[PDB]
Structures are given as C-alpha cells and as structure tokens.
Amino acid sequence: EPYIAWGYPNLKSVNELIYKRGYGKINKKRIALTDNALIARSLGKYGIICMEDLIH
Amino acid sequence: PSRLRKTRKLRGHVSHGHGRIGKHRKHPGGRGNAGGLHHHRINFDKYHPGYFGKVGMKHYHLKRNQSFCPTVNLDKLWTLVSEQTRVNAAKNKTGAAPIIDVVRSGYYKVLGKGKLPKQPVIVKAKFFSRRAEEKIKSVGGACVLVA
Amino acid sequence: SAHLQWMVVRNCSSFLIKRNKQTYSTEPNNLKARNSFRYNGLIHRKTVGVEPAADGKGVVVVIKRRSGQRKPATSYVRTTINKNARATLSSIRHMIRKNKYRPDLRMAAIRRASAILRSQKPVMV
Amino acid sequence: TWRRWHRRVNTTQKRYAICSALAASALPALVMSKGHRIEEVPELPLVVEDKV
Amino acid sequence: AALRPLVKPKIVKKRTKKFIRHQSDRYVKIKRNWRKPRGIDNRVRRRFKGQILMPNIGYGSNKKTKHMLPSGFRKFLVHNVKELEVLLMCNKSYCAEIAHNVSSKNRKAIVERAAQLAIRVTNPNARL
Amino acid sequence: GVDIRHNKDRKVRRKEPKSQDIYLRLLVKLYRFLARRTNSTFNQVVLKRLFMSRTNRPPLSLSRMIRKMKLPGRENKTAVVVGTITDDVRVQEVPKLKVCALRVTSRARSRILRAGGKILTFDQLALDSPKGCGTVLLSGPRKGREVYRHFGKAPGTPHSHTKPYVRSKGRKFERARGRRASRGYKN
Amino acid sequence: YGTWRKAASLKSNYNLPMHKMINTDLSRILKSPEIQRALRAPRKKIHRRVLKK
RNA sequence: UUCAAGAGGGCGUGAAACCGUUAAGAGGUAAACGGGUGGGGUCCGCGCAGUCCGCCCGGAGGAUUCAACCCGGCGGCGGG
RNA sequence: GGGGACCGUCCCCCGACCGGCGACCGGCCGCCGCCGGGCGCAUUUCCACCGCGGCGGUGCGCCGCGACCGGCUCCGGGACG
RNA sequence: CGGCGACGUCGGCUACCCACCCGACCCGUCUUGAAACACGGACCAAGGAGUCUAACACGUGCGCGAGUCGGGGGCUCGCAC
RNA sequence: CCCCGCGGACGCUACGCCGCGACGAGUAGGAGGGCCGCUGCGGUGAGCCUUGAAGCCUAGGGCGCGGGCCCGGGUGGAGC
Ligand SMILES: [K+]
Ligand SMILES: [K+]
Ligand SMILES: [K+]
Ligand SMILES: [K+]
Ligand SMILES: [K+]
Ligand SMILES: [K+]
Ligand SMILES: [K+]
Ligand SMILES: [K+]
Ligand SMILES: [K+]
Ligand SMILES: [Mg+2]
Ligand SMILES: [Mg+2]
Ligand SMILES: [Mg+2]
Ligand SMILES: [Mg+2]
Ligand SMILES: [Mg+2]
Ligand SMILES: [Mg+2]
C-alpha cells in the first residue's frame, strides 16, 4: 500500500497505455507493438490477433 | 611463466589480495599440523578421521618381498597368452586345452572376478580363490598348483 | 587443404603485419593485401594476383594453375596486359568471370588493376 | 641453481612434433609463410641424388 | 589539394581533456599518467562532486570514428617502401606516416612513392 | 534504479573449445554450421560436446559400446561418441559395428576393423548423416573418475562413505580415533 | 616413422599418429549435396529496430 | 686545434629537485584542483577564392588500329 | 639346440572385374578465356584539352540563413458529446 | 540560399598564461567512524617487497590409453650450437 | 531454352562480421581482457640506422575510456 498508487482505469486509459507505451515480451525481449503480426504470432492461439483484441 | 600469475595483476592493490583487516602474517594458527587436537580439531575430525591413536599389532623388520602375491582375475586370464592360442583351442576338434601359467606372466594368485569363455583351459598358479577354482571347472578346465 | 593451412598461418606468418589496430598481409598474390581466408594468396588451389609490369606500364595478371600445387617453380602463369584501361579491365573481367576462376575476386582484381594503372599515368603540375 | 631448468617431454609427444614439422615442410604455403623464398624451387618435398 | 578520405563523418569526442592523476598537480614525483585511486578514504575514488574525474568505459568513442584523425583518415606506421604498398587498396580510408627513425634519404623515396599511389602521408616534409 | 540481482546474469558455459587443436576447431566450424542451419537437435548436442573438457569427455570402453549397441532396435545404427573409444580386453567377441568417434585406440581400432566394422570421423559422419539420423549418441561414464570417490560429504561425518586423502594406506594411517568405537568414536 | 599400415621398423614401437578429421576441406564438405539437402533456407534479411511512431 | 670544446685533464650523454637571468601574463581571501566559457599568446593548417572521378552530351586535335577473321603460345572446364 | 610346417601381418609382381580421374597426373579431342604476331587504317577504338553542360557519388575553406518531413516534449486556440 | 577571404584575417573544444561563475578540506593507513587536535610524509632521482624448491588437492590443455612413464643407466665423430 | 548490352557495389582476419533486447554503485575479495609497459631468448620483418640508433628536452600535431603510443623540432653520437 505505501509503495503503489492504483485505481480503476477507464476505456480511454487502457487505449492510451497500450497504444503509446505498449511493449510486448516477445522471446524475452521488450519489443514495441508496431505491427499486429507481433501480437498475433505470440497470442493468436488465444484468439488475440490485433491491438483491439489486446485492449478488449 | 610468471607473466600468467596473480602477482602481475595485484600490482597497485595495496594488500596484495590478503586483505586490509586480517593482513598477511607469518604463522597464525601454528606451523604445519599444529593444534590438530586443539584449535584445528574440527578440520582433523571432519576430513581425517582415525588420524589420532594406535590400532593393531606392530611388526619389526617387515619384508615386503615375503608378502609378494600379485593377483589376476578370470576376466583378464586369457590375455596372458597369445590370440593364436585361444582361437586354436576353440576350433580344436579334440579336448586339448591350452596351459596358462600365470606365474610366468608375473601373477601368483588367480582371483575369480568376471566370467570365462566356454572352453577348457589348464591354469597354473601358486594360489587359487574358491570361486576362481569353481568357475574354471565350470568351463571344463583344471587348476594345478605350482611352488 | 586451404582451411587447414589457414588455421596455421591466420596468426603466425612472416607476411603478417599487425600495427595501429590494423592487420595486413604481404604475400605475393593477395588482392587488397588483407589477412583473410578469402584473399590469402598462398593457401588456395586457385588464386589470382595483379601486379605492375616489370617496366612502368601495364599490369601482370598471374593465375595459379591446378596441376603442380607442390611445385612452386611452375605453379603460376603470368600474363602481361599493356593496353588502354577499359580494355585492360575487360581482359581481367573475362579471365575471372568467363573461366569461373574464383569469381569472388573479380572486383578486387579489377579495382587493383585500376589502382595500378592510375599510379602509372604521369603526375600533374 | 636448483630452479628446475629442464623439462621432460613424453617420447610420443616428441615424435608427434617431428611428424607435424615434416608434414608442414611439404606444403608451399607454410614454407613460404616462414619466409624461405621458395619461389623457383622445382618441388618442395625437395629431393636430390645421393651424390651430394 | 590534399587527398580526401572516402567519407568524412562528424567526429564526436565525449571528452577532449586528459584524465590527470589525483594529486599530480601537487607533486613532481607524481606524473599525470592515470592511476586508479585505491585509498580507503580517497574522495576521488568515492566520486565526490567537484573532484578529479575517473576514466570509465562510458567515455568510449563511437566505433565508426575511433582512431580517426581530424582529416578523416586512420594512420598506419610505415618503415620502408615495401610496407607502403599494403595501403594501395586502402587509399581512401588509411593514411601512411613514416617512422621517426627512417633516414632523410629513404623517406624521400617513400614520399615520392606515396604520391604515385595516392596514399596520404601525415608527415610528408619531415627531414628537409 | 531497478530492483534486480546481477550475480546470475552471465551464464557459465563453454561457447568454444579451450583447446587450440586446429583439427578440432575445423570440425567445430563444421558442426557450428550444421547446428545453426538444421533443426536437428543431434547436431546441437554434438557441437556442445565438442567444446567440453577432457574430464567431461570420458573414454568409452569397447564393452560399454557393444552393450549399448546390443539393445533392441539399434541394429544398423551408427555409434557416435564425442571422445575416445577404448579397447576392453575383458570381452572376447566383437560384433560388426559402425562407429564415429573423435579418437580410437590402436588396439580397439584393429579389433573393430577385424570384426568387419567401420570407423568414421566426425567429418565423415556429417556426410553420412548430416542430421544424425540413424545414430546412437553414447557417452563414457562421466563419474568414472578417482576424484568422485573423494567428493560428497566429509569422511568424518555420519553415513558418509567418501574416500579420505591419505598419503599411504595401512593400519597406521587414519584408522583409529573416529574410525572405531574402541578409539573414542566411529560415526 | 612407418606408414599407417606399417609400424616403424627403426623405432620398435612407433606408428604414425591418426587423423581425427580425414577430410579437412570445409568448403567442399559444406557444399556437398548431402549437407545442402539437409539445410534450412538462409535467413539473409536484416531486421533493424523499428522507430516506434 | 678538432667534425665537435654548446668534448677543455673528476672532461661521453647530461634528467629531476633547486637557483640566476630574459620574455609574457597575473596578484588584498595561502597556493593548488574539477566543470564551463571568454580574452591573450606560441604554433599548426602549401587556409586564403577551396574536392575529386564514373558515365553521357557538345567543340576542337592526335594515335593506332575497334570488332570480326588467320597463325602461334598458354590457361580454365568437360569427356563413355 | 637347429632346421622345418602352420598361423598373423607384409612385400613387390604376373592378371580381370569393381567406383572415379579424384583435391595423384599426362596425350587427344570439344567449348571458353587471355596473350603475341598479321589483317582490318576509320560513322570503329583509344588518348589529352575545352564547356563557368547534364546525370550519380563524396564532400563543400570559413562563417551563416531558410524550407518541408519525421521522433520526443511543453504549451495555446476552436468545436462536439 | 547568402556573406567573406593573404602580409591581414580564417579554423584548430586539445596544449601555455590570465579572468570570471559553480563545485571543491591532504594523501596513505588502522578504524564503527579521519580534514582531523590519530600516525607516516620538506623536495627530487635511482633502488625497493607473494619468489624458487619440494609435497599435495582440484580445474584446464596435450599424448598414449588398461595401460602409462626411461626421470637412473647405456648406445650414437666427443664437445660451435 | 537470359542475351541489342556478356554485365552487376561491399562482404566472411568464422578467434570474423551483422541484428535485436535488457542492463551499468562498490571496500575486502575473485575472475577476464589488455594492438598497456620493462628486460632477455627462439623465429620472423630481403625491418630501421653515421643521409644519424639509444637517451634526453620541447608554448609542436595527434590517437586511445585508460594503461600508454605515434609523428614534428632540438640535443646526442652507435646502436634499436
Ligand atoms: K587472496
Ligand atoms: K566502474
Ligand atoms: K549454476
Ligand atoms: K660531446
Ligand atoms: K599526520
Ligand atoms: K633416461
Ligand atoms: K627480433
Ligand atoms: K591507448
Ligand atoms: K633523437
Ligand atoms: Mg580492490
Ligand atoms: Mg602504495
Ligand atoms: Mg596492509
Ligand atoms: Mg583524449
Ligand atoms: Mg606531477
Ligand atoms: Mg573509509
């Protein structure tokens, strides 16, 4: 509690966090989410294939 | 080569790797095996059990030659003769068995570790173990003693 | 073998020069004169070298023949080209490319021939 | 004086150094890389008649 | 006029001044050559503000412009004409310079040959 | 600042042979290419064994190789060991063997060849099976060394059967107090 | 020094050392059709960091 | 005199500490130091009308010979 | 004690088949390439000069200015729900 | 896209002197703690301190491998090496 | 079935070169690298040198994070 500040993000907060600062852990590397193929390669088996799916 | 050693890397470092607090001093703890029952007791007990005390009977003027009795196991027995000897015996039609003189090869006692190939052989030795004799007779061989 | 002989002389050779964070090799048939397996002029079954002519004009294209690899006296065939620069480069291009004689050295030999010819023309005032 | 100046090398080591040295002496690239000017030598495993 | 290098990138030097040894200003017996301070209370080793800076790998030059002379060339020391022809195919990236011990008569031939091969000499007029 | 520990960042592993053997370096080059440009995990294991030290490449006796080759379903397979193959004079019958080894003892080599066997080096194995198909990758006993008798718990501790370091073996050398109940204790 | 099929007749116990690599022609081995058939296609495109717009 | 006494009988070279003189600069917080600039000065830059070179176009001149064929020589590759 | 026989490795040969001419070499052919000499003697080829020529590359002796594009950032207007 | 270029200027963040702003206590050492009213240090030069032998242990490299090792001795023109 | 063009950059010291991501305090202490440095030996540089070696001096030009190094000028006089 003394070390964190937290709350309940709204839809706009999720969008701007993912789009501006969204980085994926791909092969243990911090890779910027510049293409949808980066999301689909690692998360397509779960049905997530784009930034919109990740945000949803 | 002195160029490959830690001394070349410890130049400019004041304590030469021995440390500022403890320093490097002549003989802290004693010289040699000092205090093996006192301040070095744990090391001696941990790594050298049995070090302190007498066990057994002493024997003055031990002569190692009198007890000289090298041993050979049955698995190595056929290596004392030539490869010609063992193929000839195997393909021999008769019951002729080659003679292996382990005393000639430098062994006095025949021990019985391993197994023998299924072919008879006459083994000459000063001493035989009980199991070595049993295995030699199992393959149809014989054990004969020499002095 | 070239790879085996390379492992012997890659760092231990009389032609090796290691100065100023750079490395150079001075064997006779080394285009670019660099210490490398590709450009070494001694370890390969076929090599090509470009040298200035004995006089002050033209180039000498030396190739290594395939037969006497252990016979250095007759192992190299030297030809002299003493024509215009464009025709000289064409001859070297045809010797390397048309014969398929070490095509990986084509531009290195052509560039070296240009440097030699450029050095042979008189300086200006 | 008792610095242990000498070293013993196994005989099989030493024979195997000789074999490597002899095999290297028949390859032009290695002999040239020692700088021996074997430019016009007829043949590097170079053998002459017993008359010499 | 002078032979130009193949490319002339902007050379960026992180530090332009020498790392002088601690207290080399106070003693003649201590030379400016850098030595890492290892004293228990040394404030330079502890990196107190306003003190003599310590060299570290962060000051390293860009690998693209390392060992590059202000003229955009890199130098190869040469001792005779034969060593000069190793730079024939490195004309536009490496410049020759003649070793200090080479005689006046012999370095005349080196300068003459280097002018022919379009190799740049950093000290072309050095004994005359 | 970030909250991590840097004491395990550098993994300690052989990335190349510490040997300067130019022939070993050549076939390291060959198998560095094969491991990279194929999906065969056999090439990866062989490549990393080539880096290994001699103690990590124990010799493989002829008896052990024969015994592993005699297991069901391994007929007409190549025995691959990254190390030395050693003659075992305790065996009398050598079957036909297809063998790839870094090094073969002269007596072992003569026995294998006389029995109609075939011996390959690792350059020939690459041409024969580039992916290592139809091979049995064997290893000598890694702990078949005298040092491992001394490793483990300390000898002067209960339920430890580790060999102590003694200059001599005899009734006078470390057989008294701490070794028998009559002499203080035994544990 | 002997052959690989004769022991030396003037050293009574010596034989030529054995090769651990019969064919030390790396270029020829790698270009052999047996090796080339087993390989995957080379990945020669360089992927440089993408500036996150 | 000597090549040289800027080699002159404890004389090859001739450092540092320290000192004299000359030149420049500065000076009430002991000097000295790190970072950042500014001023001055000694030098460096063949600085001082500032690159080179590939192709093509145009102009004005020379030289063979350009290609293709013939002869000879030498190489590379292939051949039941 | 010799001398023999046998066995294991050898040896140089008399010969055939087998895989290939190989990184062990030659002769013949075939293709290609280079060089030398002829011929080809000019809408070809090559050499040097000039243009304040064009296209490319590198880079401007020094000191400066502008423009648009992209990245990061701090701000300001306007409008909608 | 502009300006300026030889006896006066152009560039040289390095290097010499000076000025200003900010920062800055003297090192070494023992110590929980040194700028210390804790010790050593006036200055400069040259010298100056983990070495060698033996014995173990483990790791690594090399050769051979159920073996391995000639180190003592002997044989080789007795010796430039 | 390339051919009006017969042509098409660089590379790969594989102990090399290239890409991506994260990370960077440190006494005692440990390890790695050192194209850091000194002296001598085996090789090698058809190395350097009285047309000037070593050493020393230097408001001279530079290189390296650094240990240090190269070059100019002077002095010096036989080696490096
Ligand atoms: K220590
Ligand atoms: K650090
Ligand atoms: K671990
Ligand atoms: K004098
Ligand atoms: K004091
Ligand atoms: K001996
Ligand atoms: K030398
Ligand atoms: K440096
Ligand atoms: K001098
Ligand atoms: Mg320390
Ligand atoms: Mg000290
Ligand atoms: Mg101390
Ligand atoms: Mg610097
Ligand atoms: Mg000082
Ligand atoms: Mg402290």
Ligand SMILES: [Mg+2]
């Ligand atoms: Mg950090």
Ligand SMILES: [Mg+2]
């Ligand atoms: Mg840490």
Ligand SMILES: [Mg+2]
């Ligand atoms: Mg004088």
Ligand SMILES: [Mg+2]
């Ligand atoms: Mg004097």
Ligand SMILES: [Mg+2]
């Ligand atoms: Mg004065």
Ligand SMILES: [Mg+2]
């Ligand atoms: Mg103290």
Ligand SMILES: [Mg+2]
């Ligand atoms: Mg106290």
Ligand SMILES: [Mg+2]
């Ligand atoms: Mg203190």
Ligand SMILES: [Mg+2]
């Ligand atoms: Mg106080």
Ligand SMILES: [Mg+2]
């Ligand atoms: Mg005291």
Ligand SMILES: [Mg+2]
């Ligand atoms: Mg004193």
Ligand SMILES: [Mg+2]
């Ligand atoms: Mg005092």
Ligand SMILES: [Mg+2]
């Ligand atoms: Mg000293």
Ligand SMILES: [Mg+2]
């Ligand atoms: Mg750190």
